[PDB]
DNA sequence: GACCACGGCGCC
DNA sequence: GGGCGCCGTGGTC
């Protein structure tokens, strides 16, 4: 039933965007449902004004766009969220809709009207979820505030800075493929795998290492080609092109384009529920996989910088998952290292040149890295390898003990869950296929550790934000263990105790949350 | 122009 | 080799 407007308090929102991104998006249409009546508004902008806070689907998009208009709106309830704790693999208004009872369309009247009807039914479904519900009510939500403030935001940066970069690595890379081509005595499009696939192994005769997955093409990867440096003096070549082609095309091109006028700096998107562990997910700008690796990618990491004035603060947990680890495996010998202090690695051990293989094996067990793996991730083959390793499970055996009783538990209950019960559901774990199998066992106990870990970060954000705000500070980012904050020159250093003290001390373990923290005008140097 | 599958690769 | 998102290349609509 069609309704004035001005809807009751505590109605549902329902709105369209022309685009994606909230930050670049027009409000075409708002609508709110309530009870039963539906109420469209005339002019949605003004409209906004009306609202106490975005109930509904993707709330938290829309109260981006209300912050981006200078609107406080906050985002509430949202059925998405609901949704993906009952299942992380509900990430999209279409799924949660067809599976839950409506149609994902583009009127904001029936959005608004799915939005209410969808949060009955799923918050029905969170029955006795008192761990889900808890996630809900304690982090999932509290959160998505956090979130669009975060987006509304954004991250300043040096857009003259980039260009100039630009033009030199253009250079760089025209000498780089002028040279290959008079190795490959002719010129072909560098760029295309199956033109180079060719040159590598057709032309030239490079044995081929590997094959492609879905096409089942020799594979010009990075790891055949580093192998294959030894034999032709084109690999390197090709080596350098790749990374300068990838940092140019993927970071120092786009993003000075990307660039907002009514703030001049880069707004990109947290996605709330689009991972099967739990984590965040940055899209459109993607900043959670900015260069920071090699010299190039550190000086395109030096680009994002504070405002006149500011200072940029970065802190990063310290293998948070190694930590989450012993505390999930209860092992002893793991949480003692931890607690305590002694260096992982090189606690493990008992040289340098071990400390290189002590600290893969603790690290590789989050995947379960295979033999060969670890034999051409070493030296020692196979044969000594299953051994670096036999004293692993042998050193930390309930380790090897929770990887067990985890896969078990997720054989018979049909999902898996973190420190804080947000489950995923690995069917294949039961699979006929040793192949696809054992694929599954690798998500399996792989999502627990990953799922914990971003429990505990989700929890920090969500608890540090108000006090960031009180401070006259700004959550920026945050790189699944990391955060990068902004703080005025005044306050960067308490500014840094606090988040530091309020990220390590979360949610207490078996074992300390150590936490690095540093200051700076650029990301680069305040040491990420 | 918009979008897809795929190989490849940046980060956690 | 666990979790993502983005970029060209080829090829579709
Ligand atoms: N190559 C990597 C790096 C990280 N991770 C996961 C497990 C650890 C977590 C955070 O990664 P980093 O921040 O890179 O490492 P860290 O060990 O947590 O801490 P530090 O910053 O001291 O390296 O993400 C992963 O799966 N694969
Ligand atoms: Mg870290």
Not at 359 to 368: C, E, M, Q, R, S
Not at 387 to 392: D, G, L, Q, T, V
């Amino acid at each position: 039933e069609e309704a004035p407007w001005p809807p009751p308090e505590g109605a549902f929102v329902g709105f369209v965007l022309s685009r994606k991104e909230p930050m670049w998006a027009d409000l075409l249409a708002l609508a709110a449902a309530r009870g039963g009546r539906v109420h469209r508004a005339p002019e949605p902008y003004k409209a906004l004004r009306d609202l106490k806070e975005a109930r509904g689907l993707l709330a938290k998009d829309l109260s981006v766009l209300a912050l981006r208009e200078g609107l406080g709106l906050p985002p509430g309830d949202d059925p998405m969220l609901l949704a993906y704790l009952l299942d992380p693999s509900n990430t999209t208004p279409e799924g949660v809709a067809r599976r839950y009872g409506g149609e994902w369309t583009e009127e904001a009247g029936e959005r608004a009207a799915l939005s209410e009807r969808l949060f009955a039914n799923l918050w029905g479904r969170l029955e006795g979820e008192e761990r889900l519900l808890w996630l809900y009510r304690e982090v999932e939500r509290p959160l998505s505030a956090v979130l669009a403030h975060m987006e509304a935001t954004g991250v300043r940066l040096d857009v003259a800075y980039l260009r100039a970069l630009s033009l030199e690595v253009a250079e760089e890379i025209a000498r780089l493929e002028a040279e290959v081509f008079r190795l490959a005595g002719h010129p072909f499009n560098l760029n295309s795998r199956d033109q180079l696939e060719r040159v590598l192994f057709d032309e030239l005769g490079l044995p081929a290492i590997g094959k492609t997955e879905k096409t089942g093409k020799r594979s010009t990867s990075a790891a055949v080609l580093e192998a294959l440096r030894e034999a032709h003096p084109i690999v390197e070549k090709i080596l350098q092109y790749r990374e300068l082609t990838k940092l140019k095309s993927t970071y120092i091109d786009p993003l000075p384009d990307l660039i907002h006028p009514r703030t001049g700096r880069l707004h990109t998107r947290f996605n709330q529920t689009a991972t099967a562990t739990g984590r965040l997910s940055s899209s459109d700008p993607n900043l959670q996989n900015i260069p920071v690796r090699t010299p190039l990618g550190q000086r395109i990491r030096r680009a994002f910088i504070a405002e006149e004035g500011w200072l940029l603060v970065a802190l990063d947990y310290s293998q948070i998952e190694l930590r989450v680890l012993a505390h999930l495996s209860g092992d002893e010998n793991l949480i003692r290292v931890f607690q305590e202090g002694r260096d992982i690695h090189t606690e493990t051990a008992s040289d340098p040149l071990m400390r290189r293989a002590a600290k893969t094996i603790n690290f590789g067990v989050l995947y379960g890295m295979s033999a060969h793996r670890l034999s051409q991730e070493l030296a020692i083959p196979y044969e000594e390898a299953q051994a670096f390793i036999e004293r692993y499970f042998q050193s930390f055996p309930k380790v090897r003990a929770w990887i067990e009783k985890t896969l078990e538990e997720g054989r018979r209950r049909g999902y898996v869950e973190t420190l804080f019960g947000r489950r995923r559901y690995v069917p294949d774990l039961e699979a006929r296929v040793k192949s696809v199998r054992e694929a599954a066992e690798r998500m399996a106990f792989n999502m627990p550790v990953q799922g914990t870990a971003a429990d505990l970060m989700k929890l920090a954000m969500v608890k540090l934000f108000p006090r960031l705000e009180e401070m006259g500070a700004r959550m920026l980012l945050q790189v699944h263990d990391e955060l990068v904050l902004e703080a005025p020159k005044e306050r960067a250093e308490a500014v840094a105790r606090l988040a530091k003290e309020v990220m390590e001390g979360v949610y207490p373990l078996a074992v300390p949350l150590e936490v690095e923290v540093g200051i700076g005008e650029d990301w680069l140097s305040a040491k990420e």
